[PDB]
Enzyme design. Structure first.
Site, mmCIF file in Angstrom:
data_model
loop_
_atom_site.group_PDB
_atom_site.id
_atom_site.type_symbol
_atom_site.label_atom_id
_atom_site.label_comp_id
_atom_site.label_asym_id
_atom_site.label_seq_id
_atom_site.Cartn_x
_atom_site.Cartn_y
_atom_site.Cartn_z
ATOM 1 N N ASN A 1 -9.901 -3.043 3.307
ATOM 2 C CA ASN A 1 -9.770 -2.987 1.857
ATOM 3 C C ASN A 1 -11.133 -2.709 1.224
ATOM 4 O OD1 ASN A 1 -6.990 -3.385 1.537
ATOM 5 N ND2 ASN A 1 -7.176 -5.628 1.467
ATOM 6 N N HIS B 1 0.821 -1.211 0.000
ATOM 7 C CA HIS B 1 0.000 0.000 0.000
ATOM 8 C C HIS B 1 0.856 1.263 0.000
ATOM 9 C CE1 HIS B 1 -3.930 -2.064 1.026
ATOM 10 N NE2 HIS B 1 -3.052 -2.988 1.377
ATOM 11 N N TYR C 1 2.224 -5.226 11.758
ATOM 12 C CA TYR C 1 2.073 -3.771 11.670
ATOM 13 C C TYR C 1 2.812 -3.040 12.781
ATOM 14 C CZ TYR C 1 -1.815 -4.367 8.389
ATOM 15 O OH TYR C 1 -2.609 -4.713 7.345
HETATM 16 C C1 HEM Z 1 -7.565 -8.909 5.459
HETATM 17 C C2 HEM Z 1 -6.264 -8.746 5.185
HETATM 18 C C3 HEM Z 1 -5.561 -7.373 4.993
HETATM 19 C C4 HEM Z 1 -6.080 -6.133 4.869
HETATM 20 C C5 HEM Z 1 -7.572 -5.705 4.861
HETATM 21 C C6 HEM Z 1 -4.969 -5.207 4.718
HETATM 22 C C7 HEM Z 1 -5.044 -3.836 4.558
HETATM 23 C C8 HEM Z 1 -3.970 -2.961 4.588
HETATM 24 C C9 HEM Z 1 -4.028 -1.524 4.389
HETATM 25 C C10 HEM Z 1 -5.303 -0.701 4.103
HETATM 26 C C11 HEM Z 1 -2.798 -1.031 4.497
HETATM 27 C C12 HEM Z 1 -2.410 0.457 4.336
HETATM 28 C C13 HEM Z 1 -2.548 1.258 5.622
HETATM 29 C C14 HEM Z 1 -2.196 2.679 5.273
HETATM 30 O O1 HEM Z 1 -2.954 3.303 4.488
HETATM 31 O O2 HEM Z 1 -1.147 3.180 5.758
HETATM 32 C C15 HEM Z 1 -1.892 -2.133 4.762
HETATM 33 C C16 HEM Z 1 -0.517 -2.048 4.944
HETATM 34 C C17 HEM Z 1 0.279 -3.036 5.503
HETATM 35 N N1 HEM Z 1 -0.071 -4.368 5.625
HETATM 36 FE FE1 HEM Z 1 -1.951 -5.171 5.311
HETATM 37 N N2 HEM Z 1 -3.795 -5.925 4.766
HETATM 38 C C18 HEM Z 1 -4.119 -7.253 4.931
HETATM 39 C C19 HEM Z 1 -3.209 -8.284 5.026
HETATM 40 C C20 HEM Z 1 -1.946 -8.160 5.567
HETATM 41 C C21 HEM Z 1 -1.168 -9.226 6.162
HETATM 42 C C22 HEM Z 1 -1.662 -10.691 6.250
HETATM 43 C C23 HEM Z 1 0.009 -8.707 6.559
HETATM 44 C C24 HEM Z 1 1.193 -9.395 7.273
HETATM 45 C C25 HEM Z 1 1.029 -10.413 8.125
HETATM 46 C C26 HEM Z 1 -0.007 -7.290 6.255
HETATM 47 C C27 HEM Z 1 1.009 -6.392 6.516
HETATM 48 C C28 HEM Z 1 0.974 -5.043 6.219
HETATM 49 C C29 HEM Z 1 2.024 -4.085 6.472
HETATM 50 C C30 HEM Z 1 3.378 -4.426 7.135
HETATM 51 C C31 HEM Z 1 1.612 -2.883 6.050
HETATM 52 C C32 HEM Z 1 2.419 -1.567 6.131
HETATM 53 C C33 HEM Z 1 1.958 -0.755 7.343
HETATM 54 C C34 HEM Z 1 2.822 0.471 7.510
HETATM 55 O O3 HEM Z 1 3.935 0.521 6.919
HETATM 56 O O4 HEM Z 1 2.391 1.405 8.238
HETATM 57 N N3 HEM Z 1 -1.209 -6.998 5.642
HETATM 58 N N4 HEM Z 1 -2.648 -3.295 4.807
HETATM 59 O O LIG Z 2 -1.514 -5.378 3.556
#
Ligand code: HEM
Ligand SMILES: [O]
Ligand code: HEM
Lengths: 356, 681, 678
Positions: free
Chosen positions: C138, C65, C352
């Site tokens: 999402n 993202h 996160y």
């Molecule tokens: C239902 C599953 C998921 C949804 C709805 C989702 C949604 C999101 C969203 C909206 C963001 C962006 C947040 C922003 O705007 O700053 C994000 C970032 C991120 N996601 Fe997910 N994601 C999912 C699955 C995962 C999984 C399974 C992992 C790891 C185990 C993950 C790890 C991350 C990380 C590390 C970031 C970066 C956060 C940051 O740098 O501040 N995501 N995700």
């Molecule tokens: O994510």
């Protein structure tokens, strides 16, 4: 400085237990390397590298030191042909959690009631030390708690020590000027256990133990100190000859010497001249330094000795050859005595016990 | 193999079981759970060591030139040039030095389009046997500003507005043209970026420039001023803006795919290294101060002298570890080269060392495999984050009796050490000014505009027209007009039309001088190898068999041919849904494929409506050679193109092949672009 | 003002002299030099502090993202929801909480195009009076994978190939479709991203989903399973792929500028927050496991219940400090909410928190102004990089006589502490497995596809056809067809045509004809056309401009954003033909008289690329937009082979065109212009 230990560095054939302290360590040690090494690639540092080989789909990160061939850095995949491949208990010598471990009960933020006894084993440990060993523990507590400015904390400490032993609390209370509390016998007991005491066993070897030989550049003391040194070194001791300046055969000046550096102090014959009078007052070392080294070594429980006329050095500080860990006479007798004394290491006869 | 030294750090996982980063074979596709549908356990060390490495994958992008791509190669000297420089890599005929080169844009972030309009980076590292020498250049010979302390102001103004981070990878907004009009030294680089240099066809079709005057110094200390040039052996070539824009959406990786494909197919690109040499006492003798980085030295005054050739022939194995992590520095200098008092270069020396601390988050980045020299590192530096070596010398200081004097000092006469040019002097008051010799901001922008062809000049005017029309502030636009009027009254007049502003002459810097070597479109390409032909065909009838024979003969000439049809039948390389004219340098309709340009064959669920007509229309309108074989003549007719126009080829297969290959040398057919005044009645 | 708390960190430089970062007025336009044409001095402290700060501006982009934009707003609770949750921000009717929302793509880096095809992020922070609560969602209700340990595998396969870093912001390459076919749980989210959800018209035209089942918890420990839903009040709207591709080059900032403009003009977008609520005993009652994030719960089994509404009405002042730096976390949970044993959600909680250490390079990121809660921070944490406070409590440990017990422990009964759902238990062996109840990867993809309109289905078919045709490996394309065949034999066959392959024989195991509401985009007209954009193609010659101005005034009366286009920036002209493209507008209207630039002399001006006015009108028609022409301008429609009797094409007097265009904008996309297989 760079090596990065982890309790989570575990291999096949070892597993964890539900020890709540261990459980959190696994998280803390991985995470803290990100602070100390500011990057995720600290296991690539030479001192952290395994010798067995690293094959996974990790990539990038600060300080990436390798260049990976496999462009299909994901699993599962048809394009990498299944490699790197999964390993488990049956194939590939993989790690596996113990098959029989079960979870049962409510999710809780609690500790098992089985953890609630905080006093029995402190009492068991204290019981299993020698009398002067016990006195070392009480004198440590007396020293430490005497620095606590807050009165209530000191009484809180006494209330808790009283649950381990009433006699421990009584003996500590004297140093604090606090009243001996009344017995709280709930956890008192007299049992003992092996393997926790230090001072109840002599050393299995004296190799590498250190002997300070106090000598002098005047007269023939240094030649005798050299002969003493060469015999002691035959037993694997590290021997430092000390004098007023770095004459031939001198390892250290009195100015740089301290009893803390040695496991035994012996005065070479003729060196009694630096323990009183003109030889004790010299611009080359602080006033009284040779007497202070022998006094320190005696009072800290070390083997102490003097050869021949140097017995006068022992007399000048009130020490008698009668005593355990004190040796006088000719060279071979002092050598045998000092070497025996190093096995004992600390002579606890020189430490007063409460009501002795 | 230019990558040979990197083979000791390469990791082969084929045939192996999965491990942690500290060893031990594992499975890492299921989290450890407390019961069948239970929560994940903190003691799952496998999960956390896996996801921790993922969570920490990213490093800061470069503060500028964030978007780019690179490759390894070899540089070969054409002679023993010790009569002009003590530089080792230039010390013998046929002496070979490994290189790495990264090309880039400037303003856009890491994931922006290759075909944005921008200055382009062209950075070469020479891994010489006397250390790494970097020439950190651009595809344009002049820079926007005269003093490095102004770099944040320039970059802030062309990068996105700090409130909404709009627009991406573009100078076409208020703040950029406010700066160009407030800081008129920027007008020269601006004109270059508004020309074909701003939208090159590929990295391989750019020239390169060190921009700054440097110094070459011989063993005895005698020096000469020098300008570095890279001359592409593929020829310079540029797109048109309305095509570059579509390409930014259809393939944002256009340039990095171009370079990767050229190298994989065995068509490694080459550039010749050439210099201009100037006597020290002539630094101010050519109508400007050679310390001024907003000026270039006309070749009529000092011709290019080729020293050697660089060929880029190995792609990286891991883009991140090599291309993303490499750290260029103009301070990467070696014996035989020295700096000048150019105030822009002066501050660069500080800034590129400093910025590495941000990008690599530690001071040991020169230990990274892609940054390591091949010549050996021996000094008293110790510790630092991520220290990768174990030093043996425990007396890590100088001077010293205990270490016997080693590592030992090297200078001009001992140890082939670096030395500053011996005759250089400082004279005068410490000042925060610029030399009045830097004052002329308009003469050379006018010289550059004067030296382009009429349609090339129209490209420049039309780029300014497009860009300045995005400026919302009225006064900024008028400020831009006044500055343009100082270069050329006609240029200002023609830009003013698009802005609806009023057209008076300001002749202080006007002139009619021209110079060679700055145009792109006044010369045809020396080779058409690796250029791309899209063969539009169909799956019905015999068109595909003919398209394959067309492809076969074109490939014999070193062209990359894509046969296109409704679906991936045998012999088809790409579907109409997936095809676009931006991907090709010429478009040929195979015989029989005229059925997909009208009627039933043109309306199909397998591709967007009108797509084959659009590919042919885009190709023609963007100046490409376009062609149709046999009855496919009707496809040209359906879009209103006539068979005998320049760069349009109809007839049998053999004449089409011949006509298309000739038209690829011309590359763009500029009679298809109107010039101001053409439409008058 | 949702940004009110941030006003004490805002810095006004108007009226001031330049300074160093440590104070002191300076000039910083000339380096200090030894002599007139001399070298720069190391003692120029002014130069180095200015360039050091510039040299260190960049921080790592988000690992996923990376590309996105955000805004501030207000959430308003419609009721006292204490009957279902102890959450304070839902505790009273008309209770207002500040929010910040970030929207995003997933795969692309920070400068990639907004209109790439991708899953989209929809992350909301409620700055509640009992701490920050984030719904990190999402625009699609299901995710690719069932266990968080597989997230690096999914992301590595979708992101560019690691040898050359190609392709940017795209799933259309070998490794992604290799993964989609090797890991069949991915097919459900894949289908969604292959639909209009992958190319939305704007952030304001997306629904949002928490995806995971969570738990709402009352004060007495009773819990309900919950799905979070954001329902857009603007209506869902999508582009066509061939349009999104051009828009990716013509304006990479299409979505972030759309949201910026809507807020700035007073057209703040809104979403309703709604839940599905089911008992604990329903976790495996609906033919799937509610802990499985690759399945959504059909609204026929549990209807949406609205709890409140969020409105985004304040743009950031500094993008970097606010939007770039904000750190969302599914671990940002408050009293009244709890997690479930969703194996995907479980690992996110670790990820996160950890990743913030990389992006912010220190442990104090919660102290940044955009990350701070409004409810106060009181604990024994100390030090760390960039520690921005000065703690008064010198007895920074618990338990303790000396701090009198403060800060004090809070739990279910004392101090409104967080508490895990009291009834949750664990049972069975520790295992590295998934429940067999997770096994079915094909039923719900079929359910989704079944519930789209016929052209909406062709869009999914044509997206898969486009994507899979980029896969160079023959066997991967065959593996794809075998997996699509398990969802729908018809889908596999129609996809196979474009691939030149033979689709496998029917595999009826998971086939079915069931449909479900609320997953389609094109089966519903838009509820408002406010903020929608009309391009008016005019000319500077003749009387066309005056009519275009009058046409613009009437259109703006219906809340539309109108751009008058002509050859150059004459009076009343918003944009030149050189700068214009059909991707920028929701409708295209030729003003009367402007037919003169669609043929003949007027079409050949040097001021714009050849054919530009005709291409704009051609693009708008083929991309399905309402297109129109006033009076004599119908010649422009005829010049491109379009005629008035078609749906979404309007001609006649100004009054007739405006009424027709505005009603056509409600339909938004005219699907009769897209061929369907057969
Ligand atoms: C239902 C599953 C998921 C949804 C709805 C989702 C949604 C999101 C969203 C909206 C963001 C962006 C947040 C922003 O705007 O700053 C994000 C970032 C991120 N996601 Fe997910 N994601 C999912 C699955 C995962 C999984 C399974 C992992 C790891 C185990 C993950 C790890 C991350 C990380 C590390 C970031 C970066 C956060 C940051 O740098 O501040 N995501 N995700
Ligand atoms: O994510
Ligand atoms: C003639 C003028 C200049 C030229 C030809 C030039 C060229 C370049 C190039 C080609 C790169 C990217 C190298 C790569 O591909 O990794 C770059 C990056 C950079 N430039 Fe310049 N530049 C110029 C002026 C400046 C100035 C005046 C400054 C600051 C005082 C500056 C600061 C930087 C920085 C900090 C980077 C990032 C380096 C890194 O992160 O590794 N540049 N420049």
């Amino acid at each position: 400085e760079q090596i990065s230990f982890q309790p989570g560095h575990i291999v096949r054939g070892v597993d964890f237990t539900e020890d709540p302290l261990l459980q959190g360590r696994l998280y803390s040690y991985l995470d803290t390397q990100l602070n100390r090494h500011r990057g995720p690639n600290f296991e690539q540092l030479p001192i952290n590298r395994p010798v067995s080989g690293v094959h996974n789909n990790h990539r990038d990160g600060q300080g990436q030191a390798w260049i990976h061939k496999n462009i299909h850095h994901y699993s599962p995949s048809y394009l990498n042909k299944g490699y790197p491949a999964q390993a488990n208990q049956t194939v590939g010598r993989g790690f596996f959690t113990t098959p029989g471990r079960t979870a049962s009960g409510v999710l809780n933020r609690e500790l098992s009631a089985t953890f609630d006894d905080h006093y029995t084993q402190p009492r068991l440990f204290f019981n299993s030390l020698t009398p002067v060993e016990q006195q070392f523990v009480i004198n440590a507590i007396r020293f430490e708690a005497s620095h606590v400015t807050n009165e209530q904390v000191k009484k809180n400490v006494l209330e808790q020590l009283n649950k381990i032993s009433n006699d421990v609390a009584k003996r500590v209370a004297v140093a604090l000027g606090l009243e001996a509390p009344q017995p709280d016998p709930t956890y008192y007991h007299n049992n003992v256990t092996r393997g926790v005491s230090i001072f109840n066993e002599s050393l299995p070897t004296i190799a590498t133990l250190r002997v300070g030989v106090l000598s002098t550049t005047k007269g023939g003391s240094l030649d005798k100190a050299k002969a003493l040194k060469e015999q002691l070194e035959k037993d694997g001791l590290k021997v430092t000859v000390i004098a007023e300046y770095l004459a031939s055969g001198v390892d250290q000046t009195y100015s740089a010497a301290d009893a803390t550096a040695f496991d035994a102090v012996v005065v070479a014959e003729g060196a009694e001249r630096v323990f009183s009078g003109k030889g004790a007052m010299s611009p080359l070392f602080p006033a009284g330094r040779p007497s202070q080294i022998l006094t320190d070594g005696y009072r800290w429980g070390k083997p102490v000795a003097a050869v021949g006329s140097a017995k006068k050095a022992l007399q000048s500080i009130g020490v008698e050859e009668k005593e355990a860990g004190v040796y006088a006479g000719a060279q071979d007798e002092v050598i045998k005595g000092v070497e025996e004394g190093l096995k004992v290491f600390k002579f606890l006869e020189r430490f007063a016990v409460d009501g002795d | 193999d230019a990558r040979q030294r990197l083979k000791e750090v390469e990791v082969d996982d084929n045939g192996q079981f999965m491990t942690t980063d500290f060893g031990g074979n594992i499975e890492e596709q299921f989290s450890l759970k407390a019961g069948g549908r239970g929560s994940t356990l903190l003691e799952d060390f496998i999960f956390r060591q896996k996801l921790q490495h993922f969570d920490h994958e990213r490093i800061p992008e470069r503060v500028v030139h964030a978007r780019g791509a690179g490759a390894h190669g070899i540089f070969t000297s054409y002679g023993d040039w010790s009569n002009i420089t003590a530089a080792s890599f230039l010390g013998a005929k046929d002496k070979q030095t490994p290189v790495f080169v990264r090309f880039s844009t400037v303003a856009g972030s890491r994931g922006s389009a290759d075909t944005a309009r921008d200055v382009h980076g062209f950075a070469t590292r020479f891994y010489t046997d006397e250390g790494n020498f970097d020439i950190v250049g651009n595809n344009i010979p002049v820079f926007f500003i005269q003093d490095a302390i102004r770099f944040p102001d320039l970059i802030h103004s062309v990068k996105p507005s700090p409130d909404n981070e709009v627009p991406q990878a573009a100078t076409a907004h208020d703040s950029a043209w406010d700066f160009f009009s407030s800081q008129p030294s920027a007008l020269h680089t601006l004109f270059w970026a508004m020309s074909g240099n701003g939208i090159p066809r590929s990295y391989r079709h750019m020239d390169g420039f060190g921009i700054h005057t440097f110094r070459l110094v011989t063993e005895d200390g005698k020096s000469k001023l020098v300008k570095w040039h890279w001359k592409t052996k593929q020829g310079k070539a540029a797109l048109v803006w309305e095509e570059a824009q579509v390409l930014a959406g259809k393939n944002a990786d256009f340039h990095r795919q171009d370079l990767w494909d050229a190298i994989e197919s065995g068509n490694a690109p080459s550039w010749e290294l050439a210099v201009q040499l100037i006597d020290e006492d002539k630094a101010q003798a050519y109508g400007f101060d050679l310390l001024d980085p907003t000026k270039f030295l006309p070749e009529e005054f000092a011709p290019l002298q080729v020293l050697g050739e660089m060929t880029l022939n190995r792609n990286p194995m891991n883009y991140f570890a090599e291309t993303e992590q490499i750290s260029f520095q103009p301070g990467h200098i070696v014996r035989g080269v020295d700096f000048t008092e150019d105030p822009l270069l002066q501050g660069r020396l500080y800034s590129y060392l400093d910025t590495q601390l941000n990008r690599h988050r530690g001071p040991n980045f020169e230990q990274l495999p892609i940054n390591r020299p091949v010549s050996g590192v021996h000094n008293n530096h110790r510790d630092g984050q991520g220290q990768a070596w174990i030093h043996k010398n425990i007396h890590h200081y100088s001077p010293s009796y205990l270490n016997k004097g080693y590592p030992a000092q090297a200078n001009q006469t001992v140890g082939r050490g670096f030395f500053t040019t011996p005759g250089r002097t400082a004279s005068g008051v410490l000042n925060r000014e610029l030399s009045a010799t830097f004052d002329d901001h308009y003469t050379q922008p006018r010289l550059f505009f004067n030296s382009l062809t009429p349609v090339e000049q129209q490209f420049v005017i039309n780029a300014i027209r497009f860009e300045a029309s995005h400026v919302t502030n009225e006064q900024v636009k008028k400020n831009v007009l006044e500055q343009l009027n100082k270069i050329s009254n006609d240029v200002a007049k023609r830009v003013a039309v698009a802005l609806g502003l009023e057209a008076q002459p300001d002749p202080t810097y006007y002139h009619n001088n021209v110079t060679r070597g700055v145009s792109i479109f006044n010369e045809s390409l020396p080779t058409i190898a690796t250029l791309r032909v899209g063969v539009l065909s169909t799956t019905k009838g015999g068109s595909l068999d003919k398209a394959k024979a067309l492809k076969e003969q074109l490939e014999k000439d070193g062209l990359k041919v894509t046969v296109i049809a409704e679906y991936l039948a045998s012999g088809v390389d790409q579907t109409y849904s997936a095809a676009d004219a931006t991907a090709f340098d010429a478009v040929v309709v195979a015989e029989g494929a005229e059925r997909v340009f009208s009627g039933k064959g043109a309306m199909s669920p397998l591709f967007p409506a009108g797509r084959p007509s659009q590919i042919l229309t885009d190709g023609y309108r963007w100046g490409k050679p376009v062609a149709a074989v046999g009855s496919a003549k009707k496809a040209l007719q359906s879009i209103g193109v006539e068979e005998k126009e320049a760069g349009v080829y109809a007839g049998a297969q053999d004449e089409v092949i011949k006509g298309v290959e000739e038209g690829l040398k011309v590359f763009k057919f500029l009679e298809r672009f109107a010039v101001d005044g053409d439409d008058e009645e």
